[PDB]
Design a protein around this ligand. Structure first.
Ligand SMILES: O=P(O)(O)OC[C@H]1O[C@](O)(COP(=O)(O)O)[C@@H](O)[C@@H]1O
Ligand SMILES: O=P(O)(O)OC[C@H]1O[C@](O)(COP(=O)(O)O)[C@@H](O)[C@@H]1O
Ligand SMILES: O=P(O)(O)OC[C@H]1O[C@](O)(COP(=O)(O)O)[C@@H](O)[C@@H]1O
Ligand SMILES: O=P(O)(O)OC[C@H]1O[C@](O)(COP(=O)(O)O)[C@@H](O)[C@@H]1O
Lengths: 431, 511, 511, 515
């Protein structure tokens, strides 16, 4: 009863009328969880407890701290992550995100609708960005991105050694919102950094820009993060306010791909509980999603394509709703084939099984993608290697309770090795 | 343009206003064409031109003719069909359909016509050997007294003459002529409302169906079905020798309309037989029954046939009326899988012009179909399947619109996998490749399915064998102009030979 | 049950032939008056059966002949003027001949249908020496400039598109028959695709329009409108004495369809003249043109008529065909304001039967209309307005759906207040009370409007005069069965006497 | 947000949300404010009326009858301070929040301010013997629920101090409980206790509530916020206690437990309104499910046309800070986008340091969220789900709303005596404000519970001719509308009247230009 009665309502109002607090959700949680790591959670042993509580991405705020400090944070993060590698099935990749300092003023001061002469990427940012490339980070949260000319300046700094590092522009000013479209078309994703946004724009208007930015990225198929202050009271209290709970649930209902925690995990006194709460609420909001309107409106807004993979993805999502599938298993190398299934927001989890660890780590940016890293070696026959990576996803889904033997799942593959060829959709029962 | 400008509309109204007569239909014709064969089309030379003009199913009306007669009809249809079998790429399968006689009621030989004045008195007698003047007519039993009663009305000769039982009668019946006119010999009489005690499959029908199974018919049009047991009574007579023969129940009276749901469940398809239905139920209500039965079969994924008087005036004139051109087009927009011609091709003076006209109207109407709404509502009114073939067909048709593919190539042994794709009505044509000739001939009942018979022998490697059939569809799709090399098509496959395993869908480039 | 459906597909499945329609037929019925219906006795029964608008076809007959018909129509109309509660306004429509191309007399004989051999040569000469000397080898047409419009082996259609030819000559033509037939004296010629340069309003149309103003006709059916300038030429010809006469532009050729927007913009309404349209454009595309023009006029709130050959077989048979039964219903479902009858009531054998059938089918079709989508779509596509009348109209239509009212009573001098209500297509009838006789007759053009002519004198207290006409509508609604006492109706009045000023909507109980 | 409201889809409507599209002047969402020490001065209460307060709430969980009678007198004096100008006077209703079945602890170490430090994993005994009643410490805790043993089994969870402290039982002794602390902290005196998933056999209407309700009827309040209604019979007990003298006062059921939501439909049919009461609800049910219950309740009362309020912790951070939380900003807006009739403030106005900024912030966010409402979808779904009524006013109301959208009416002027006609118009959520004209002060105050109804109380005397009395008020509404900036001269307004004096006869809709 994953709010399936509400998902069959002919109207959006009756769908709300049918929401049932006694109807439990599916064990799979589709929204990524980004926890800012700091003094309260840098310990290697407590980082393990945060992975178990559902952390997907470890955020590193570079507004303070030295490279020697952040390298120890990354060292322990990876130590906690690989502590579960003694198990390929239940292992879970954890990403490393670099939030740059950006154009600041420092105690930090703020100035609304003004010019901000500071450059997009100063030498402090360049030395921090090149540090991330050396540390093998998975993504960059570029702060105070005001125009498209800033993302290109950041992309050039990362260079070709980190060409595959995904850039997440942080909308933090009024100019960034006013010029959001050229920023989104230039970025790998967007973060709605409500923290600094609520000071530059009127606080009563932050919800307008958040829902606008999430929708526009939702139609564009790009990840969007809701950031800062979702459970701020949890910094000193073990339970969030009613407003904070509904904020996390509404961000997931708005369509945000990941939800973020900053002070709640960096310096607060209840970092484990804040991660556990965000996991619980996001899973509940995923059940309350009105997929009947979401899947239709996303398809109607999406254009016709000559791309075989895009056509397979829509058909795969349409097939999953038809048979209430346990998961969408997608063989992917660069994550792209999994990203194209995610943009149509299926209900079932997207078990994106891959061999590239960086794509498994970057998979958390997208809603509903559950990456699994296959350490098995390539078989001589390609057919055997494809079905091996699919059976690897079957064993994972059974262990993580995503589905059981006899259930129906959709498997996405392609006709030849290499990337951009995902074009084969199969409806197979779980062995 | 294929009326794609009107397809990208939000409202049905704006979609109606965007309809363009200068928007040429690029797609093939998706609606099946059925044509009754008669003295105007029995010849081989005529039948080949009917195939060229678009005939997908040959209907044989067994209320007239003899087994010897119909046997030569079938022989000529099969001769005309296989005359195009030289090239298997362009070959078109043509099915043969037996239209059961059913529980009809005719009159006696007059004294060739006569005249019954309006308001006069006619004593319908059930006497012995009077099998007829302007006062005393004889029926084929019907047991009219046991089913007739008060001021009941009898309709002689296709409802053109209206009677009115104005008495009771021991073995006769005194009636007043509610609507006059002439009267030929042995004309059919309909008794609306009443429950004709005649059986489901009469002794004549048994010999007909047993003859049809002995002649390898592809489907039967069961006349005057009223209850679900009638379809079972017909399927029993077909037995195990003809268990693969589709049963299309003809809905023709108030009972068959009321009991429609159980009839649809027991039958393989429905024919909206508007001819007799227009006599048994008020003629102004037929469009309601027609739209009701088409939508319900569309909901149930069963074929539905719109039949009779679609191009009636084309029996004597070379062009249809404006009402007839719009009736065919609206039957397509209603959702009819097939359309039918009766006297237009059986005994008319322009049978070819009729088939060509139905092919032309249907192709334009398929462009005017509001696919944006039809597809969403068809999926909404369909339940969660747990069947891999059903889910595969939904994604295939979803990928059909997304990539705007030129065709849906489906490998099918019994047609079922193709029927499940056509259920969701893709704009793109369904190229169903089969090695089973009967499955190719029966695929015509389904809208949008272009069956193609692959006569190539089965290959040893199963991967290479289904590849050979996928290419076979690629060649017939490029030969008939459905798509060119480099286009995107949807190819439906399964994971092992035999039927029931269609589970693979691919978007592959046309070679 | 059908109106309460979340999907259009389920709306079709819930279409019940056992749900009796409401008492109110909303689609106007336009009957062409001819030799079979000119008698006052027959025109009386035509009004009783449901004729709202009498149409005179000025393609034939003389002014003396039509003036007698108009006299007979008004005699049969005022035959019921004694009780103004049951009296039905019946408008008179003038159908212009327009730029018609006709042939001569065959062998100088007005009723000598000659012959034509499929493929035989036929001379198309302009030499007036063959005017009353047409033979099976030489045919004369009255369009002297045909050779400057028709050239590359083009197609020429004679006798309602039945006979088609292919010219093979030049200079003031050798026709090669492409479809044989039987010619006749003074039959119509169509030149599809070619640009006929004939004047919009010929010297003959001037005399008919002058006659029409003198005869106090309510609307003109301007045949063969090619552009908006033609509509303006008709409007100027009518002048001051001819204003208030509604101009219905007949769309009959490719040019009128291509320029439909400018033509509609300058017209009072549109008539889908499928007869000629089916010859000028391919007959398969006519339904696209009809549905396009019906949708576009619905969006604009202007009347649209679907015409010619709706019940064509009823010229000779008392019962229509199934194609004809569905064409009338689909016209109403398309959203046609009026359906028309031409030869069926002018020269046919069953004029009354044809009017009753159109009434029956239209009333059944009005019930089956999916109002949930139509009222929503017609509202979405309609823009916002500062006009209080427009705001009061939508509010009144939404109110009538909410309380399921029996009627929507509107007082109007011009008719406009009633027209703005009918644009949003309520289910309940619109009883437009007026003291203006022409406004009552012209109201027949709009769907759902049931005009009543109040003849009681105007009271001194305007409020009492307003309340008087409201009670008059209550009386006719009670008398005609639209609603009973205790039911709820919507009443629309204004805040001051005079036209416009309609801003009051009151939900009142029927006394 | 006229561009977002024209989108054919919800997604595009969200993408079209312009942060630079200024809202309308009218704020359609009622603002309820709990009155307390930081809000009781009539100098302050005047400032809250001017900052947007429409309903003043009295939490009868604490305080005595003489204390609350002072607040009411202080509230009423603040409102009548504006009655000098009838064209701008804003009615302010007062509301009585009952205590309900409440479980409070005892005094710690004989003080009211003393606090002990509890530690997770430590032990704490819960006894019902009235001896330790004012001798609580980290070892013995007393609570005033006598039968707190015939409900709590072994291993259950008892929550103390607004759910901040968690206990885990381990032993039951009829009179004692040897629990264990799961989450510790400073334990105070007389803190609230929450027992989730237990048949609290305490009555919904206590003897203290029966006296507080009779005090409410005597004090001429406008509505009753009853607490912890588990069944409709509880609403009937409140209804009977109010009797005939209090027959007009609205009963607003606060759902605060698992039984309330499970029987919400039966409760909503028995009440005149609903309060979500998220505070107690987030403790009795998992906090991650509160948004589900809130959305379900707001939707079901929208489908029914009854008022629903979102309460507790909407701007909680503003108790100590002058600027709210983005989550709190997102929460007020999303409550307005959910369709909540009114939004409430509890600690932010009762004891907070910035009560005025919270009222202003709520009025700001609600004005913005009202513009972002997808009126195209809402008005269609409300009509498709509302029945075909035989009432002439329901048809007039939905007909005026459809006409309001058609001409973009500046407002919908409604003449109402019992407010029922303004309620019927509000049920369909027009964008334009509902200027409701009444001579009934009880009506002009109770109209704040419904969204979009801007109540105006006409103090002019009844003219001799009834048709002249209607035009006098219909002209008063445009005076209020022209002044408060809802429209100007020439704009088109919808006016709803009746054919006869007396309630229940409004059936006339008029599209008129403002003079
Ligand atoms: O998701 P991506 O990066 O576009 O690649 C998906 C690819 O994975 C495959 O399943 C197998 O690729 P590999 O040979 O790299 O394992 C292909 O069929 C498909 O093209
Ligand atoms: O349409 P049907 O009756 O399910 O048949 C489809 C079958 O055809 C196949 O494509 C292959 O069948 P064959 O090898 O017998 O030709 C299977 O994948 C599938 O089960
Ligand atoms: O359709 P029209 O021309 O606007 O007629 C509506 C008019 O009729 C009335 O209801 C009454 O008009 P009269 O009584 O003067 O004939 C006016 O209030 C209104 O302006
Ligand atoms: O109290 P309700 O039900 O809202 O009704 C409002 C009433 O106010 C009126 O407009 C005028 O009544 P009053 O004489 O009390 O002013 C009536 O027409 C209507 O019945």
């Amino acid at each position: 009863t994953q709010q399936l009665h509400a998902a069959m309502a002919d109207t959006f109002l009756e769908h709300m009328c049918r929401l049932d607090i006694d109807s439990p959700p599916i064990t799979a949680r589709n929204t990524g969880i980004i926890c800012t790591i700091g003094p309260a959670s840098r310990s290697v042993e407590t980082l393990k407890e945060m992975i178990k509580s559902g952390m997907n991405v470890a955020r590193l705020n570079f507004s303070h701290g030295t490279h020697e400090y952040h390298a120890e944070t990354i060292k322990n993060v990876r130590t906690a992550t690989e502590s579960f590698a003694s198990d390929p099935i239940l292992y879970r990749p954890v990403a490393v995100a670099l939030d740059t300092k950006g154009p600041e003023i420092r105690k930090g001061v703020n100035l609304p609708g003004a010019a901000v002469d500071l450059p997009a990427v100063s030498e402090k940012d360049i030395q921090d960005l090149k540090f991330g490339v050396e540390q093998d980070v998975d993504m960059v949260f570029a702060s105070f991105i005001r125009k498209a000319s800033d993302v290109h300046e950041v992309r050039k700094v990362l260079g070709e050694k980190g060409k595959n590092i995904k850039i997440i522009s942080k909308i933090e000013n009024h100019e960034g919102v006013r010029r959001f479209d050229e920023i989104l078309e230039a970025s790998d994703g967007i973060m709605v950094a409500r923290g600094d946004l609520g000071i530059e724009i009127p606080a009563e208007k932050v919800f307008l820009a958040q829902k606008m930015m999430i929708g526009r990225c939702n139609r564009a198929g790009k990840p969007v993060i809701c950031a800062t202050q979702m459970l701020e009271s949890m910094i000193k209290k073990p339970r969030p306010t009613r407003a904070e709970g509904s904020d996390v649930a509404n961000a997931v209902l708005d369509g945000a791909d990941c939800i973020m925690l900053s002070g709640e995990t960096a310096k607060g006194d209840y970092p484990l509980e804040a991660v556990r709460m965000q996991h619980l609420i996001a899973r509940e909001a995923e059940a309350a999603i009105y997929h009947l309107q979401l899947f239709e409106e996303l398809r109607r807004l999406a254009p016709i394509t000559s791309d075989p993979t895009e056509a397979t993805a829509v058909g795969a999502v349409e097939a999953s709703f038809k048979c209430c599938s346990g998961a969408i298993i997608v063989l992917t190398k660069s994550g792209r084939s999994a990203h194209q299934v995610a943009r149509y927001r299926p209900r079932a989890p997207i078990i994106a099984v891959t061999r590239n660890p960086q794509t498994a780590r970057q998979a958390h940016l997208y809603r509903g993608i559950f990456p699994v890293l296959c350490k098995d070696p390539v078989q001589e026959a390609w057919a055997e290697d494809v079905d091996l990576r699919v059976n690897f996803a079957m064993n994972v889904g059974k262990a993580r309770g995503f589905f059981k033997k006899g259930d129906v799942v959709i498997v996405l593959t392609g006709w030849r090795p290499g990337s951009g060829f995902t074009n084969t959709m199969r409806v197979v029962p779980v062995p």
